[PDB]
DNA sequence: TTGACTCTCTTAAGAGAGTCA
DNA sequence: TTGACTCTCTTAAGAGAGTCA
């Protein structure tokens, strides 16, 4: 269908349209206590959102271009990977936010990969806190940390080993 | 059921079924290169599974026994739980195999704690390898690693910053 | 061709409840 | 009373597709 001009196009509309979306600057914890800086580009709470972009769910939304009278749509923060393999390992890939901001579309902060590896990164301990991504983290993750856990493991009787 | 003396007869019983279920032993990574055992108490792979136990889904079970002549239920990894609170921070408490071996049943390799928790566990390095899970982990999570991500943050033109 | 809404689906860690015998 | 099945739901990281003007 598209060809590879058609689907550069694509990506080139959709950089100039998330480029003008707001820059919010955020100080975010990079693991071994040191703080970093990122700089998201956050798209807007409510329409209008940008040229081509619609809300598909609370935090879901989707690009749209029509080319020789068909349209064509996209998840909104899969634009950046249109030219990558879709799959690796027989898993479906996806956008990934390395800034852990929804509504961010900067493509420094994406990348695309399993979902498996995307949640993942949710725990990590940050890019200066041991992380072992292959494609290194921006940040610790949001949820990395001791937990809080109710009840650990315990037994009443003598059943049972570790 | 709703008496204290109730709930302690509900785990002793389950105790001592799950106490009667094969035990499997299985060697673990326990991150740092370092290697451990765990005894795993494996629910069998079909009927019939022991008293008071069924299954609801390919791999959930649920547990239950008739009190006052009524019929009292619950997710079959749930019952060592049920004297603690149901709810942290808003969040539901759910029992979590440290073990991540679903079939097991053995509440020595058990936690409760919230979903975001539980599922954090899959990636962390594991008890010797920089685990901070106030309640410890027992090995390193199953998706630990490097990933296998496909495309990493990049732009075409020149609109963004990280 | 475009915007602003609408709907349902996937995954893998987890759940509750009803139908029969 | 107990067993063996059936069904759908929750969450938070992600998706595709329809309607109307
Ligand atoms: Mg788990
Ligand atoms: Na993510
Ligand atoms: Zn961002
Ligand atoms: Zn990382
Ligand atoms: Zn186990
Ligand atoms: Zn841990």
Known sequence: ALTN??????????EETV???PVITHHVPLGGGLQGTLHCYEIPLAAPY??????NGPTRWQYKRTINQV????????VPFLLEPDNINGKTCTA???CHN???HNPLHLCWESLDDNKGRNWCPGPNGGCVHAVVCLRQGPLYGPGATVAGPQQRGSHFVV
Do not use: E
Request: contains cysteine; charged residues 10%; positive net charge.
């Open 5 to 14: 001009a058609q689907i550069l196009a694509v990506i080139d509309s959709w």
């Open 19 to 21: 480029g003008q979306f």
């Open 50 to 55: 940008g040229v081509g972009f619609a809300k």
């Open 71 to 78: 349209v064509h749509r996209w998840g909104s923060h899969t």
């Open 96 to 98: 990934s936010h390395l």
């Open 102 to 104: 929804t509504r961010c």
